[PDB]
RNA sequence: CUAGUACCGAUUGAAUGGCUUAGUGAGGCCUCAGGAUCUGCUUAGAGUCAGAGCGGAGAA
């Protein structure tokens, strides 16, 4: 069930090279983003003028143990 | 499998520079012309009323 990689180096840089090529929105774009968000967590959101709220992308397999 | 290194070699792709055939050529300067306008003199208008004629300067 665990992911196994072999050459970490050759996998790492190969993945990055594709990702910049497949980019849909790029630096300096104005964007709206729609996130499938479980509504019960909404109680934890704070006013973004008082508290920093930030969003990060993930690379393909980074979710796998 | 990755790295490096060079060779051709495809589009002139897409540019920069030297030499070169043919053709064209801005601008000011010199020179042949032109004469919007302004103005002096003169017999002459009326007793400024005009006209004519002889000069000087001079922009496009």
Curated annotation (Swiss-Prot):
It is found in: Cytoplasm; Nucleus, Nucleolus. Belongs to the TRAFAC class translation factor GTPase superfamily. Bms1-like GTPase family. TSR1 subfamily. Required for 40S ribosomal subunit synthesis. Required for normal export of the pre-40S particles from the nucleus to the cytoplasm. Its subcellular location and association with pre-40S subunitshifts from mixed cytoplasm/nucleus to all nuclear in RPS19 disruptions, suggesting it acts after the ribosomal protein. Present with 1390 molecules/cell in log phase SD medium. Interacts with RIO2. This is Ribosome biogenesis protein TSR1. It comes from Saccharomyces cerevisiae (strain ATCC 204508 / S288c) (Baker's yeast). The lineage of its organism: Eukaryota, Fungi, Dikarya, Ascomycota, Saccharomycotina. The chain holds residues 527 to 591 of 788 of the full protein.
